[PDB]
Coordinates of C-alpha atoms in Angstrom, one line a residue:
Chain Z
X1 CA -3.2 21.4 -68.3
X2 CA -0.1 20.3 -66.4
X3 CA 0.8 21.2 -62.8
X4 CA 3.7 20.8 -60.5
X5 CA 2.9 18.5 -57.5
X6 CA 5.3 16.9 -55.0
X7 CA 2.7 15.3 -52.7
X8 CA -0.7 14.0 -53.4
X9 CA -2.4 17.0 -51.8
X10 CA -1.2 19.1 -54.8
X11 CA -2.8 17.0 -57.5
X12 CA -5.5 18.7 -59.6
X13 CA -8.4 16.3 -60.2
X14 CA -9.5 18.2 -63.4
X15 CA -6.2 19.3 -64.9
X16 CA -6.1 16.9 -68.0
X17 CA -9.1 18.4 -69.7
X18 CA -10.5 17.0 -72.9
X19 CA -9.0 19.9 -75.0
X20 CA -5.4 19.3 -73.7
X21 CA -2.9 17.8 -76.2
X22 CA -1.9 14.1 -75.9
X23 CA 1.8 15.0 -76.1
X24 CA 1.6 15.9 -72.4
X25 CA -0.3 12.7 -71.4
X26 CA 2.9 10.8 -70.8
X27 CA 4.1 13.4 -68.3
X28 CA 0.8 13.2 -66.5
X29 CA 1.3 9.5 -65.9
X30 CA 4.8 10.1 -64.6
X31 CA 3.5 12.8 -62.4
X32 CA 1.0 10.5 -60.8
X33 CA 3.6 7.9 -60.0
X34 CA 6.0 10.5 -58.6
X35 CA 3.3 11.7 -56.2
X36 CA 2.7 8.3 -54.7
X37 CA 6.5 7.7 -54.4
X38 CA 6.8 10.9 -52.5
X39 CA 3.9 10.2 -50.1
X40 CA 4.6 6.6 -49.0
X41 CA 8.3 6.1 -49.6
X42 CA 8.6 3.2 -47.2
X43 CA 5.3 1.2 -47.8
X44 CA 6.1 -2.1 -49.4
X45 CA 3.6 -4.7 -47.9
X46 CA -0.1 -4.8 -47.8
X47 CA -1.8 -2.5 -45.3
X48 CA -4.8 -4.6 -44.1
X49 CA -6.2 -2.1 -41.5
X50 CA -9.5 -0.3 -42.3
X51 CA -10.4 3.3 -42.3
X52 CA -12.0 3.2 -38.9
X53 CA -8.8 1.8 -37.3
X54 CA -6.7 4.4 -39.0
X55 CA -9.0 7.2 -37.8
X56 CA -8.9 5.8 -34.3
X57 CA -5.2 6.9 -34.1
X58 CA -6.3 10.6 -33.8
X59 CA -7.6 9.8 -30.3
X60 CA -5.1 10.7 -27.6
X61 CA -7.0 9.8 -24.5
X62 CA -6.0 6.2 -25.1
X63 CA -2.3 7.1 -25.0
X64 CA -0.5 7.3 -21.7
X65 CA 0.3 10.9 -21.0
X66 CA 3.6 11.8 -19.3
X67 CA 3.7 11.9 -15.5
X68 CA 1.8 8.7 -14.5
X69 CA 3.4 6.3 -12.1
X70 CA 3.4 2.5 -12.1
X71 CA 5.0 -0.4 -10.2
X72 CA 7.4 -2.6 -12.1
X73 CA 7.8 -6.4 -11.7
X74 CA 10.9 -6.8 -13.9
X75 CA 14.5 -6.2 -13.2
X76 CA 16.0 -2.7 -13.2
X77 CA 18.0 -3.5 -16.4
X78 CA 14.8 -4.2 -18.4
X79 CA 13.0 -1.0 -17.3
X80 CA 11.0 0.3 -20.3
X81 CA 12.2 3.4 -22.1
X82 CA 10.6 6.6 -21.0
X83 CA 10.2 5.4 -17.4
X84 CA 12.5 6.3 -14.5
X85 CA 12.7 4.7 -11.1
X86 CA 10.7 6.5 -8.5
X87 CA 13.7 7.2 -6.3
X88 CA 12.6 10.8 -5.6
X89 CA 15.5 12.2 -7.7
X90 CA 15.0 14.4 -10.7
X91 CA 12.1 15.7 -12.6
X92 CA 9.9 14.5 -15.5
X93 CA 9.8 15.9 -19.1
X94 CA 7.3 18.6 -18.0
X95 CA 9.4 19.3 -14.9
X96 CA 7.3 17.6 -12.2
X97 CA 9.7 16.3 -9.5
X98 CA 9.9 12.5 -9.2
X99 CA 8.3 11.3 -6.0
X100 CA 10.2 8.9 -3.7
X101 CA 8.5 5.5 -3.1
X102 CA 11.6 3.6 -1.9
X103 CA 10.6 1.7 1.3
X104 CA 7.2 3.4 1.5
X105 CA 3.5 3.0 0.5
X106 CA 1.1 4.8 -1.8
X107 CA -1.1 6.8 0.5
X108 CA -4.1 8.2 -1.3
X109 CA -4.3 12.0 -0.7
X110 CA -6.6 14.7 -2.0
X111 CA -3.7 17.2 -2.3
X112 CA -4.8 19.2 0.7
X113 CA -4.2 16.9 3.7
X114 CA -0.6 16.4 2.7
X115 CA 1.8 17.7 0.0
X116 CA 2.1 15.4 -3.0
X117 CA 5.0 13.0 -2.5
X118 CA 5.2 13.6 1.3
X119 CA 6.8 10.6 3.2
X120 CA 5.4 9.9 6.6
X121 CA 4.9 7.1 9.1
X122 CA 7.5 4.5 10.3
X123 CA 7.7 0.9 11.5
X124 CA 9.7 1.9 14.6
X125 CA 9.5 5.4 16.0
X126 CA 9.5 5.3 19.8
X127 CA 8.4 3.0 22.5
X128 CA 7.6 3.2 26.2
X129 CA 5.3 1.2 28.6
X130 CA 3.5 2.6 31.6
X131 CA 1.1 1.0 34.1
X132 CA -0.8 2.5 36.9
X133 CA -1.4 1.7 40.6
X134 CA -3.8 -0.8 42.1
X135 CA -5.9 -0.1 45.1
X136 CA -4.6 -2.9 47.4
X137 CA -6.9 -4.7 49.8
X138 CA -6.0 -6.2 53.2
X139 CA -5.5 -9.6 51.5
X140 CA -3.1 -8.2 49.0
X141 CA -0.1 -8.8 51.3
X142 CA 1.0 -12.4 51.5
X143 CA 0.4 -14.8 54.4
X144 CA 3.0 -13.0 56.6
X145 CA 3.3 -12.9 60.3
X146 CA 5.3 -10.6 62.6
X147 CA 7.2 -12.5 65.3
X148 CA 7.0 -11.1 68.8
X149 CA 10.4 -10.7 70.4
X150 CA 10.7 -8.5 73.5
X151 CA 13.7 -6.2 73.2
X152 CA 16.5 -7.1 75.5
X153 CA 16.0 -8.8 78.8
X154 CA 12.5 -7.4 79.1
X155 CA 11.1 -7.3 82.6
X156 CA 7.4 -6.7 82.6
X157 CA 6.3 -4.7 85.6
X158 CA 3.2 -6.6 86.3
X159 CA 2.5 -6.9 90.1
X160 CA 0.0 -5.7 92.7
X161 CA 0.3 -1.9 92.4
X162 CA 1.9 -1.4 88.9
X163 CA 0.0 -1.9 85.7
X164 CA 1.4 -4.5 83.3
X165 CA 4.0 -2.7 81.1
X166 CA 6.6 -4.6 79.0
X167 CA 9.5 -2.6 80.3
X168 CA 12.4 -3.9 78.2
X169 CA 15.9 -2.9 79.0
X170 CA 18.7 -3.2 76.5
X171 CA 20.3 -6.6 76.3
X172 CA 19.8 -10.2 75.0
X173 CA 16.5 -9.9 73.2
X174 CA 14.5 -12.9 74.7
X175 CA 13.0 -14.3 71.5
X176 CA 9.9 -16.0 72.9
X177 CA 8.0 -18.4 70.6
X178 CA 5.2 -15.8 70.4
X179 CA 3.6 -14.9 67.0
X180 CA 1.2 -12.3 65.8
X181 CA -1.8 -13.1 63.7
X182 CA -1.0 -13.3 60.0
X183 CA -2.6 -10.7 57.8
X184 CA -3.3 -11.0 54.1
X185 CA -2.9 -13.9 51.7
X186 CA -1.3 -12.4 48.5
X187 CA -4.3 -11.9 46.3
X188 CA -4.4 -10.5 42.7
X189 CA -3.6 -6.8 42.2
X190 CA -4.3 -5.7 38.6
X191 CA -3.1 -2.8 36.5
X192 CA -4.0 -1.2 33.2
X193 CA -1.6 -0.2 30.4
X194 CA -0.9 3.2 28.9
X195 CA 1.9 2.1 26.6
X196 CA 3.5 4.4 24.0
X197 CA 3.3 2.6 20.7
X198 CA 4.6 4.5 17.6
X199 CA 6.3 1.2 16.7
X200 CA 4.6 0.5 13.4
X201 CA 3.5 -3.0 12.6
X202 CA 4.3 -3.7 8.9
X203 CA 1.5 -5.8 7.2
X204 CA 2.4 -8.4 4.6
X205 CA 3.8 -6.7 1.5
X206 CA 5.5 -7.4 -1.8
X207 CA 8.8 -5.9 -3.1
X208 CA 8.3 -4.3 -6.5
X209 CA 10.0 -1.4 -8.3
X210 CA 8.4 2.0 -8.8
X211 CA 8.8 3.7 -12.2
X212 CA 7.2 7.0 -13.3
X213 CA 6.7 7.7 -17.0
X214 CA 9.1 10.4 -18.1
Chain K
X1 CA -14.8 0.4 -70.2
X2 CA -15.0 3.4 -67.9
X3 CA -16.0 3.2 -64.2
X4 CA -17.1 5.8 -61.6
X5 CA -15.4 5.5 -58.2
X6 CA -15.6 7.6 -55.0
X7 CA -12.8 5.9 -53.1
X8 CA -9.9 3.7 -54.2
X9 CA -11.8 0.5 -53.3
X10 CA -14.0 0.9 -56.3
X11 CA -11.2 1.2 -58.9
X12 CA -11.4 -1.6 -61.5
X13 CA -7.8 -2.9 -62.1
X14 CA -8.6 -4.1 -65.6
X15 CA -11.0 -1.5 -67.0
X16 CA -9.0 0.3 -69.7
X17 CA -8.9 -2.8 -72.0
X18 CA -6.9 -2.7 -75.2
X19 CA -10.1 -2.5 -77.3
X20 CA -11.3 0.8 -75.7
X21 CA -11.1 4.2 -77.4
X22 CA -8.3 6.5 -76.7
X23 CA -10.6 9.5 -76.3
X24 CA -11.6 8.1 -72.9
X25 CA -8.1 7.9 -71.6
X26 CA -8.0 11.4 -70.3
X27 CA -11.1 10.7 -68.2
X28 CA -9.4 7.7 -66.6
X29 CA -6.5 9.9 -65.5
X30 CA -8.9 12.4 -63.9
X31 CA -10.7 9.5 -62.2
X32 CA -7.5 8.2 -60.6
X33 CA -6.6 11.6 -59.2
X34 CA -10.1 12.1 -57.8
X35 CA -10.0 8.8 -56.0
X36 CA -6.8 9.7 -54.2
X37 CA -8.0 13.1 -53.3
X38 CA -11.1 11.5 -51.7
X39 CA -9.2 8.9 -49.7
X40 CA -6.4 11.0 -48.1
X41 CA -7.8 14.5 -48.0
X42 CA -5.5 15.6 -45.2
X43 CA -2.2 14.0 -46.1
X44 CA 0.3 16.7 -47.2
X45 CA 3.7 15.5 -45.9
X46 CA 5.7 12.3 -46.3
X47 CA 4.6 9.3 -44.3
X48 CA 7.8 7.5 -43.2
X49 CA 6.2 4.6 -41.3
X50 CA 6.4 1.1 -42.7
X51 CA 3.7 -1.4 -43.3
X52 CA 4.3 -3.4 -40.2
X53 CA 4.0 -0.4 -38.0
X54 CA 0.7 0.5 -39.6
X55 CA -0.6 -3.0 -39.3
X56 CA 0.4 -2.9 -35.6
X57 CA -2.4 -0.3 -35.0
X58 CA -5.0 -3.1 -35.4
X59 CA -3.6 -4.6 -32.2
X60 CA -5.6 -3.3 -29.2
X61 CA -4.3 -5.4 -26.3
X62 CA -1.6 -2.8 -25.6
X63 CA -4.3 -0.1 -25.6
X64 CA -5.4 0.7 -22.0
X65 CA -9.0 -0.3 -21.3
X66 CA -11.6 1.8 -19.6
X67 CA -11.8 1.4 -15.8
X68 CA -8.1 1.1 -15.3
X69 CA -6.9 2.9 -12.2
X70 CA -3.5 4.5 -11.6
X71 CA -1.6 6.8 -9.2
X72 CA -1.1 10.4 -10.5
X73 CA 2.0 12.3 -9.4
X74 CA 0.7 15.7 -10.6
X75 CA -1.8 18.2 -9.2
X76 CA -5.6 17.7 -9.4
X77 CA -5.8 20.6 -11.9
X78 CA -3.5 18.8 -14.4
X79 CA -5.4 15.5 -14.4
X80 CA -5.3 13.9 -17.9
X81 CA -8.5 13.7 -19.8
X82 CA -10.5 10.5 -19.5
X83 CA -9.5 10.1 -15.8
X84 CA -11.6 10.8 -12.7
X85 CA -10.2 11.1 -9.2
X86 CA -10.8 8.1 -6.9
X87 CA -13.4 9.6 -4.7
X88 CA -15.6 6.5 -4.8
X89 CA -18.4 8.5 -6.6
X90 CA -19.9 7.5 -9.9
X91 CA -19.3 4.7 -12.3
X92 CA -17.2 4.1 -15.5
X93 CA -18.2 3.9 -19.1
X94 CA -18.9 0.2 -18.9
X95 CA -20.6 0.6 -15.6
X96 CA -17.9 -0.5 -13.1
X97 CA -18.5 1.4 -9.8
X98 CA -15.8 3.9 -8.8
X99 CA -13.9 2.7 -5.7
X100 CA -12.8 5.1 -3.0
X101 CA -9.0 5.2 -2.4
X102 CA -8.7 8.4 -0.4
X103 CA -6.7 7.8 2.8
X104 CA -6.3 4.1 2.0
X105 CA -3.8 1.5 0.7
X106 CA -4.0 -0.9 -2.2
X107 CA -4.8 -4.3 -0.5
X108 CA -4.3 -7.2 -2.9
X109 CA -7.2 -9.5 -2.9
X110 CA -8.2 -12.7 -4.8
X111 CA -11.8 -11.7 -5.2
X112 CA -13.0 -14.3 -2.6
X113 CA -11.7 -12.9 0.8
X114 CA -13.3 -9.4 0.3
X115 CA -15.4 -7.7 -2.3
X116 CA -13.5 -5.4 -4.7
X117 CA -13.4 -1.8 -3.4
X118 CA -14.2 -2.8 0.2
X119 CA -12.5 -0.5 2.8
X120 CA -11.0 -2.2 5.8
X121 CA -8.5 -1.6 8.5
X122 CA -8.1 1.6 10.6
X123 CA -5.4 3.6 12.3
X124 CA -7.6 3.8 15.5
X125 CA -10.2 1.1 16.4
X126 CA -10.0 0.6 20.2
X127 CA -7.5 0.2 23.0
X128 CA -7.5 -1.4 26.4
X129 CA -4.7 -1.9 29.0
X130 CA -5.0 -4.9 31.3
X131 CA -2.3 -6.6 33.4
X132 CA -2.9 -9.3 35.9
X133 CA -1.9 -9.9 39.5
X134 CA 1.5 -11.3 40.7
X135 CA 1.9 -14.3 43.0
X136 CA 3.5 -12.3 45.7
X137 CA 6.4 -13.6 47.9
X138 CA 6.9 -13.1 51.6
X139 CA 9.4 -10.3 50.9
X140 CA 7.1 -8.5 48.5
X141 CA 6.0 -6.3 51.4
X142 CA 8.2 -3.4 52.3
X143 CA 10.3 -3.0 55.5
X144 CA 7.4 -2.4 57.9
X145 CA 6.6 -3.3 61.5
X146 CA 3.7 -3.2 63.9
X147 CA 4.2 -1.3 67.1
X148 CA 3.0 -2.9 70.3
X149 CA 0.5 -0.7 72.1
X150 CA -1.8 -1.7 74.9
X151 CA -5.4 -0.6 74.8
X152 CA -6.3 1.7 77.7
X153 CA -4.4 1.3 80.9
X154 CA -3.8 -2.4 80.2
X155 CA -2.5 -4.3 83.3
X156 CA -1.2 -7.8 83.0
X157 CA -2.7 -10.1 85.6
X158 CA 0.7 -11.7 86.2
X159 CA 1.0 -13.0 89.8
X160 CA 1.7 -16.3 91.6
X161 CA -1.5 -18.1 90.9
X162 CA -3.0 -16.2 88.0
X163 CA -1.9 -16.7 84.4
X164 CA -0.3 -13.7 82.8
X165 CA -2.9 -12.1 80.7
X166 CA -2.9 -8.4 79.5
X167 CA -6.5 -7.9 80.7
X168 CA -6.9 -4.3 79.6
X169 CA -10.0 -2.3 80.2
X170 CA -11.0 1.0 78.7
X171 CA -8.9 4.0 79.4
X172 CA -5.9 6.1 78.2
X173 CA -4.0 3.9 75.8
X174 CA -0.4 4.0 77.1
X175 CA 1.8 3.2 74.1
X176 CA 4.9 1.5 75.3
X177 CA 8.1 1.5 73.2
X178 CA 7.7 -2.1 71.9
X179 CA 8.0 -2.9 68.2
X180 CA 7.3 -6.3 66.5
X181 CA 9.4 -8.0 63.9
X182 CA 9.6 -6.4 60.4
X183 CA 8.2 -8.5 57.6
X184 CA 9.4 -8.2 54.0
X185 CA 11.5 -5.6 52.2
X186 CA 9.6 -4.7 49.0
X187 CA 11.0 -7.0 46.4
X188 CA 10.1 -7.1 42.7
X189 CA 6.6 -8.3 41.6
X190 CA 6.1 -8.8 37.9
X191 CA 2.9 -8.8 35.8
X192 CA 1.9 -9.9 32.4
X193 CA -0.3 -8.0 29.9
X194 CA -3.3 -9.0 27.9
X195 CA -3.6 -5.7 26.0
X196 CA -6.4 -5.0 23.5
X197 CA -4.7 -3.3 20.5
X198 CA -6.6 -2.9 17.2
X199 CA -5.3 0.7 17.0
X200 CA -3.6 0.7 13.6
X201 CA -0.1 1.9 13.0
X202 CA 0.8 3.8 9.8
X203 CA 3.9 2.4 8.1
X204 CA 6.1 4.6 5.8
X205 CA 4.0 6.0 2.9
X206 CA 4.0 8.5 0.1
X207 CA 1.4 11.1 -0.8
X208 CA 0.0 10.7 -4.4
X209 CA -3.2 11.2 -6.3
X210 CA -5.3 8.3 -7.5
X211 CA -7.3 8.5 -10.8
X212 CA -9.3 5.8 -12.6
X213 CA -9.7 5.9 -16.4
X214 CA -13.3 6.7 -17.3
Chain H
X1 CA 9.3 1.2 -70.9
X2 CA 7.0 -1.0 -68.9
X3 CA 7.8 -2.6 -65.5
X4 CA 6.3 -5.3 -63.4
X5 CA 5.1 -3.9 -60.1
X6 CA 2.9 -5.5 -57.4
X7 CA 3.1 -2.7 -54.7
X8 CA 3.5 1.0 -54.9
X9 CA 7.2 0.8 -53.9
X10 CA 8.0 -0.9 -57.2
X11 CA 6.6 1.8 -59.4
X12 CA 9.2 3.5 -61.7
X13 CA 8.5 7.2 -61.7
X14 CA 10.3 7.8 -65.1
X15 CA 9.2 4.7 -67.0
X16 CA 6.8 6.1 -69.7
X17 CA 9.3 8.2 -71.5
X18 CA 8.4 10.6 -74.3
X19 CA 9.8 8.2 -76.9
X20 CA 7.6 5.2 -75.9
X21 CA 4.7 3.9 -77.9
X22 CA 1.1 5.0 -77.3
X23 CA -0.2 1.4 -77.5
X24 CA 1.4 0.6 -74.1
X25 CA -0.1 3.6 -72.3
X26 CA -3.3 1.9 -71.5
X27 CA -1.3 -0.9 -69.8
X28 CA 0.4 1.7 -67.6
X29 CA -3.0 2.9 -66.4
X30 CA -4.0 -0.6 -65.4
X31 CA -0.7 -1.1 -63.6
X32 CA -1.2 2.0 -61.5
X33 CA -4.7 0.9 -60.4
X34 CA -3.5 -2.6 -59.6
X35 CA -0.7 -1.2 -57.4
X36 CA -3.1 0.8 -55.3
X37 CA -5.5 -2.1 -55.0
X38 CA -2.7 -4.3 -53.8
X39 CA -1.5 -1.7 -51.2
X40 CA -4.7 -0.8 -49.4
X41 CA -7.1 -3.8 -50.0
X42 CA -9.4 -2.9 -47.1
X43 CA -9.5 1.0 -47.2
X44 CA -13.1 2.0 -48.2
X45 CA -13.8 5.3 -46.5
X46 CA -12.0 8.6 -46.1
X47 CA -8.9 8.8 -43.8
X48 CA -9.0 12.2 -42.2
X49 CA -5.8 11.9 -40.1
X50 CA -2.8 14.0 -40.9
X51 CA 0.8 13.0 -41.7
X52 CA 2.1 13.9 -38.3
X53 CA -0.4 11.7 -36.5
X54 CA 0.4 8.7 -38.7
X55 CA 4.1 9.3 -38.1
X56 CA 3.6 9.4 -34.4
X57 CA 2.6 5.7 -34.5
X58 CA 6.2 4.7 -34.9
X59 CA 6.9 6.0 -31.3
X60 CA 6.9 3.1 -28.8
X61 CA 7.3 5.1 -25.6
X62 CA 3.6 5.7 -25.9
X63 CA 3.2 1.9 -25.9
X64 CA 2.8 0.1 -22.6
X65 CA 5.4 -2.7 -22.7
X66 CA 4.9 -6.2 -21.2
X67 CA 6.1 -6.6 -17.7
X68 CA 4.5 -3.8 -15.6
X69 CA 1.7 -4.6 -13.2
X70 CA -1.5 -2.6 -12.6
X71 CA -4.3 -2.7 -10.1
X72 CA -7.8 -3.3 -11.4
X73 CA -11.2 -2.1 -10.2
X74 CA -13.3 -4.4 -12.3
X75 CA -14.5 -7.9 -11.7
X76 CA -12.2 -10.9 -12.4
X77 CA -14.3 -12.0 -15.4
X78 CA -13.9 -8.6 -17.1
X79 CA -10.1 -8.6 -16.8
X80 CA -8.6 -7.1 -20.0
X81 CA -7.0 -9.5 -22.4
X82 CA -3.2 -9.9 -22.1
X83 CA -3.4 -9.3 -18.3
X84 CA -3.1 -12.1 -15.7
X85 CA -3.8 -11.9 -12.0
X86 CA -0.7 -11.3 -9.9
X87 CA -1.0 -14.5 -8.1
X88 CA 2.8 -15.2 -8.1
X89 CA 2.3 -18.1 -10.5
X90 CA 4.1 -18.2 -13.9
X91 CA 6.2 -15.7 -15.8
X92 CA 5.6 -13.1 -18.5
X93 CA 6.1 -13.5 -22.3
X94 CA 9.6 -12.1 -21.9
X95 CA 10.2 -14.3 -18.8
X96 CA 9.6 -11.8 -16.0
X97 CA 8.4 -13.9 -13.0
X98 CA 4.9 -13.0 -11.7
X99 CA 5.0 -11.5 -8.2
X100 CA 2.4 -12.4 -5.7
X101 CA 0.3 -9.5 -4.4
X102 CA -2.6 -11.5 -2.8
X103 CA -2.9 -10.1 0.7
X104 CA 0.1 -7.9 0.2
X105 CA 1.1 -4.2 -0.2
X106 CA 3.4 -2.5 -2.7
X107 CA 6.8 -2.1 -1.0
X108 CA 9.1 0.1 -3.0
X109 CA 12.6 -1.3 -3.3
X110 CA 15.8 -0.1 -4.9
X111 CA 16.9 -3.5 -6.2
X112 CA 19.6 -3.9 -3.5
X113 CA 17.8 -4.0 -0.1
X114 CA 15.3 -6.7 -1.3
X115 CA 14.8 -8.8 -4.3
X116 CA 11.8 -8.2 -6.6
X117 CA 8.7 -9.9 -5.3
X118 CA 10.0 -10.3 -1.7
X119 CA 7.3 -10.7 0.9
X120 CA 7.6 -9.7 4.6
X121 CA 5.6 -8.6 7.6
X122 CA 2.4 -10.1 8.9
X123 CA -0.9 -9.0 10.4
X124 CA -0.4 -11.4 13.4
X125 CA 3.2 -12.4 14.3
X126 CA 3.5 -12.9 18.1
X127 CA 2.3 -11.2 21.3
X128 CA 3.7 -11.2 24.9
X129 CA 2.9 -9.1 27.9
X130 CA 5.5 -8.3 30.5
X131 CA 5.6 -5.5 33.1
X132 CA 8.3 -4.9 35.7
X133 CA 8.4 -4.7 39.5
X134 CA 8.4 -1.6 41.6
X135 CA 10.2 -0.8 44.8
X136 CA 7.3 -0.6 47.2
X137 CA 7.3 2.2 49.8
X138 CA 6.6 1.6 53.4
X139 CA 3.1 3.0 52.8
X140 CA 2.4 0.6 50.0
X141 CA 0.9 -2.0 52.4
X142 CA -2.9 -1.7 53.0
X143 CA -4.6 -0.8 56.3
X144 CA -3.8 -4.1 58.0
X145 CA -3.0 -5.1 61.6
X146 CA -1.7 -8.1 63.5
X147 CA -3.6 -9.3 66.6
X148 CA -1.7 -10.1 69.8
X149 CA -2.7 -13.7 70.5
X150 CA -0.8 -15.7 73.1
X151 CA 0.1 -19.3 72.3
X152 CA -1.2 -21.8 74.8
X153 CA -1.9 -20.9 78.4
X154 CA 0.7 -18.2 78.2
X155 CA 1.9 -17.0 81.6
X156 CA 4.4 -14.2 82.4
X157 CA 7.2 -15.0 84.8
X158 CA 6.8 -11.6 86.4
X159 CA 7.4 -11.5 90.1
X160 CA 9.4 -9.4 92.6
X161 CA 12.8 -10.4 91.4
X162 CA 12.2 -12.5 88.2
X163 CA 12.3 -10.8 84.8
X164 CA 8.8 -10.7 83.2
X165 CA 8.9 -13.1 80.3
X166 CA 5.8 -14.4 78.5
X167 CA 6.8 -18.0 78.9
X168 CA 3.8 -19.6 77.1
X169 CA 3.8 -23.4 76.6
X170 CA 1.5 -25.4 74.4
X171 CA -2.2 -25.5 75.3
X172 CA -5.4 -23.6 75.0
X173 CA -4.5 -20.6 72.9
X174 CA -5.8 -17.6 75.0
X175 CA -6.6 -14.9 72.5
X176 CA -6.4 -11.6 74.3
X177 CA -8.2 -8.6 72.6
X178 CA -4.9 -6.9 71.9
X179 CA -4.2 -5.4 68.5
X180 CA -0.8 -4.2 67.3
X181 CA -0.3 -0.9 65.5
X182 CA -1.5 -1.1 61.8
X183 CA 0.9 0.1 59.1
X184 CA 0.2 1.4 55.7
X185 CA -3.0 2.0 53.7
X186 CA -2.2 0.6 50.2
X187 CA -1.1 3.5 48.1
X188 CA -0.4 3.6 44.3
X189 CA 2.4 1.4 43.0
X190 CA 3.3 2.1 39.4
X191 CA 5.2 0.1 36.8
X192 CA 6.1 0.1 33.1
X193 CA 5.6 -2.3 30.2
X194 CA 8.0 -4.0 27.8
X195 CA 5.4 -5.7 25.6
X196 CA 6.5 -7.9 22.7
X197 CA 4.1 -6.7 20.0
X198 CA 4.6 -7.6 16.4
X199 CA 0.9 -8.3 15.6
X200 CA 0.2 -6.3 12.5
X201 CA -2.3 -3.5 12.7
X202 CA -3.4 -3.0 9.1
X203 CA -4.1 0.7 8.3
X204 CA -7.1 1.7 6.2
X205 CA -7.0 0.1 2.7
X206 CA -9.1 -0.7 -0.3
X207 CA -9.7 -4.0 -2.1
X208 CA -8.4 -3.9 -5.7
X209 CA -7.2 -6.7 -8.0
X210 CA -3.6 -6.9 -9.3
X211 CA -2.9 -7.9 -12.9
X212 CA 0.3 -8.0 -14.9
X213 CA 0.4 -7.4 -18.6
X214 CA 1.5 -10.7 -20.2

């Protein structure tokens, strides 16, 4: 007979039976047209895709799920919709907090060594140098000599009966041109280093934005 | 005449010619309905997209290809389907080996300097401290002297006819209160360093997961 | 009446009124078929997706825009179409300049500290070693002594009345076996370091390509 259908899913593929009257046939035609106009109200051009391509839409693994992060080479004004700069401020659509990547690096973690989004390391933390002593040899000292000057007006008691003793009374120190044998030459005394070096050395980098999909 | 079609592609646009019998017209109607019901069996609501949007599905360059890798800001449990953690184990669908990114950084390469996925650099390789000696000056030595002591009971052979010589035999060393000239005062001696420092320094980073699309 | 329609959007859902002639009805049928054949020229199999999935195509937040950059684990030959190596050469389709990531690291910037694509830091900048001096103690000297050698034929003017002075003129240097008191033994003198160390120590990394979506 005749049925009420708004969308194509409600069409009855056997309704206009052979015994039905022709006076309703016109209505049937109208009905069919109506159905199409209620299912594709905006289609006006040719749809050239095939059935396989249309069925491929159902796959969702292709589509980018919320929560991924990317680095952005464009300006901040042209940031794509649904992506927020990874400033560490705010949460995503599902509530995951935005990580902070400003002036940092992506350090691959297993989720157990560090908490996700943890910021660590620095280019300049603390600095201190420290050597250690050198076992000096006799030649470590320079080619130095000790001048021999007898204190005051020294009168050495060397005669027949008294042993030779440089008995020097206080007074004008008689600087004789007497010298003692030089010792040492000023050789090389070497040390090791136990420097404190948390000063980080930044390798070559590039400056790019960081945006996480909302 | 009349045709039999399973899908809309087999509909004949000129079949019900003006010379055909009217008793077949009903059949035609049924046929049309059947065709639609076999081509869109799951469509029940309005489809508001336009032809251009539907034709855009054929474009695949925007679709993300297998083997792409990304940083994931969520937990390991909430990893999106089609992605595997960057543990360096296994291969992709097309056979690309999985690189290991745990505890590493993304080092941009041109494919000629290093092989893709190669792990280089380390936070601790080796260390050695090594200064060198200083060309010491005469004042490098501290304020030190050498006391004048005579070995044994040293007696000078100083008389009228014998040259004064402190000819001292073995005996009790009588140390007289004589002191030689001081040499030096202990000035500053500087060294340079030839340190061996491959011990890597960790710059600022952030802790995130890494997953590659299967 | 009868209308001229090429696509489904031009169909009049109320055209075949009840007062129209039967002789035109056949034409109506043809028209409908033609419309469908002109709207889906390539559909030849069942389309099992639902209305909601087709409607979801209109969303573009699901679509990765031109401009962002990704890192790639595959070979250079198998780079996906529409992606060009981030060699710093050229611009995108919308005009975003290509950053250079060869031998670089991703440095997150807020758009004010640095411009996009800025490169800094190096693996080998400069190196200088520099210790400092230490105030040497009196014990810093090694176990060294100075011999008491008398210049020339040294004779003391020691008589009964004349002060004993080792008045030694030039001549044969008479070396008496007299040794002055040794001082020091060469103990530990310690310093610090003020090394100039910008040579980059690259932390552990991995080698991955960098490609920008054109």
